[PDB]
Design a protein around this ligand. Structure first.
Ligand SMILES: Nc1ncnc2c1ncn2[C@@H]1O[C@H](COP(=O)(O)O)[C@@H](OP(=O)(O)O)[C@H]1O
Ligand SMILES: NCCc1ccc(O)c(O)c1
Length: 287
């Protein structure tokens, strides 16, 4: 469990920090589609929906390989696996790219080329809980310690990829001057079909009503949990140890209520009120 490295004010996992070198040579294509999110906000879920739309709704094509192979993770630079930049050299256009990078660290080529971006945000409480367990099972992140300890660091933005408040705000802001579909995890939970339809419209594609419903079922938590091509059980137990905490934990909005103590919840609400003061952004802590 290596410590974080700071780059341009952003805490990152050593392997990611390093990948930033080669990334300066990455060339974006006009027809690329970027999927950006703060960690644990629904990356894998929207990646599956998008790969299905691109594969015309064919499940056997989506089965072609694990999601992290179909949707390369830009910064990924894990031990004993192809770098993200590498995997992208051989990915057939149009490409689907995954990333958690803040605007400060995102390769300029993506902005210059006006690449469309699908962004997904989730209420901070659930993100914090989900991120704590992820720290437990993902052997690449530093020691999370106790939940109380973690939560403190989460509020200070002292975790991989940095501040969640700043991440969601910047992207929300950028969606004025750049083509950005800004989605909400909770909305996706509430009415899948309604959201996938916004996506289809965004990428400018269309599908038969019946194919649509089909995706809805195969992008369900239940389904994605059994599917080994999307539940991350195909990576070594030295990268991810699912016995500690499954990658697909609960898939619920509102589950934070069973982890936050009343004291923690009070401390967090006050803090959040200060940080989100002048922002038009609005999150639903439950359904
Ligand atoms: N089809 C789906 N429906 C709902 N939640 C899903 C999902 N697929 C994955 N998730 C949830 O999305 C989170 C991980 O997101 P990311 O891919 O950005 O890391 C996890 O949250 P929880 O651990 O709270 O359940 C995971 O269980
Ligand atoms: N280091 C293992 C790969 C990894 C690390 C952090 C993340 O947030 C993610 O989605 C994937």
């Amino acid at each position: 469990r290596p410590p974080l490295e700071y780059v341009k004010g952003v805490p990152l996992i050593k392997y990611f920090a390093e990948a930033l070198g080669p990334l300066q040579s990455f060339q974006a294509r006009p027809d690329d589609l970027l999927i950006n999110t703060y960690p644990k906000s629904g990356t894998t879920w929207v990646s599956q929906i998008l790969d299905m739309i691109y594969q015309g709704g064919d499940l056997e094509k989506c089965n072609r390989a694990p999601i992290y192979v179909r949707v390369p993770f830009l910064e990924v630079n894990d031990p004993g696996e192809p770098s993200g930049l590498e995997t992208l050299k051989d990915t057939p256009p149009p490409r689907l790219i995954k990333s958690h990078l803040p605007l400060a660290l995102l390769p300029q080529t993506l902005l210059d080329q006006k690449v469309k971006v699908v962004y997904v945000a989730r209420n901070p409480k659930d993100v914090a809980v989900s991120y704590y367990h992820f720290h437990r099972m993902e052997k690449a992140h530093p020691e999370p310690g106790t939940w109380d300890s973690f939560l403190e660091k989460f509020m200070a933005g002292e975790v991989s990829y940095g501040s969640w408040y700043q991440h969601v705000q910047e992207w929300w802001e950028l969606s004025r001057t750049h083509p950005v579909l800004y989605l909400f995890y909770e909305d996706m939970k509430e009415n899948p079909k309604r959201e996938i339809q916004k996506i289809l419209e965004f990428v400018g594609r269309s599908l038969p009503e019946e194919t649509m419903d089909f995706m809805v079922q195969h992008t369900s938590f239940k389904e994605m949990k059994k599917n080994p091509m999307t539940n991350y059980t195909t990576v070594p137990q030295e990268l991810m140890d699912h016995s500690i905490s499954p990658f697909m934990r609960k898939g619920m909005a509102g589950d934070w209520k069973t982890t936050f103590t009343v004291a923690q919840n009070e401390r967090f609400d006050a803090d959040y009120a200060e940080k989100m003061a002048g922002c038009s952004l609005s999150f639903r802590s439950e359904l």
